[PDB]
């Protein structure tokens, strides 16, 4: 269980408990569970890298050790 931050378009920065093998769909679903945002109205990025459906967090080398907590962002 690794903690990530997700910055919504409202300025609000929320948190999420993810697995490194969690698909981007899973993360978007969690975001839907915490903010009521429909997954199809979600565009995730990390450090300018688009996070696309059909892939996983490990695919993007986002997560590292437990000390670091990546800030994900929802685009427009």
């Amino acid at each position: 269980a690794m903690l990530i931050f997700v910055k919504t378009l409202t300025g609000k920065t929320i948190t999420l408990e993810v697995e490194p093998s969690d698909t981007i769909e899973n993360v978007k679903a969690k975001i839907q569970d915490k903010e009521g945002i429909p997954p199809d109205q979600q565009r995730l990025i990390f450090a300018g890298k688009s996070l696309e459906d059909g892939r996983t967090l490990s695919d993007y080398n986002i997560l590292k050790d437990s000390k670091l907590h990546p800030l994900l962002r929802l685009r427009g």
Binding site: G11, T13, T15, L68
Partner: protein, 114 residues
């Protein structure tokens, strides 16, 4: 009211910097650009996070991690923190520096509201 504040809006949630706008619970306008009503018990009243406070800072590579306040710098209405991580210091936006539940809990005795 009108005082700088680091406050959280959720149990086991993180503390974020902002300001008290109105006394209702208190209405908080965060530096992140969000405003909402939060409990008074979840509000830390210290405008500059004191030296050597363990905080959570957002580095240039977009990772939040724990660090330690070593200096403040006010540049025309905007504050920047000098945060040390593993022996290296960097300058962070005020909005980039936050507190975990524990990190925030340590400050409650001294800067807690009420």
């Amino acid at each position: 009211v009108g005082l700088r504040v680091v406050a959280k809006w959720s149990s086991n949630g993180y503390f974020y910097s902002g300001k008290i706008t109105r006394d209702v619970k208190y209405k908080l306008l965060f530096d992140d650009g969000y405003e909402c009503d939060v409990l008074g018990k979840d509000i830390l009243l210290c405008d500059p996070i004191p030296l050597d406070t363990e905080v959570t800072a957002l580095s240039e590579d977009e990772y939040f991690s724990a660090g330690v306040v070593k200096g403040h710098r006010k540049e025309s209405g905007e504050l920047y923190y000098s945060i040390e991580k593993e022996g290296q210091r960097k300058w962070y936006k005020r909005m980039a520096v936050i507190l975990s539940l524990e990190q925030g809990n340590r400050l409650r005795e001294q800067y807690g509201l009420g």
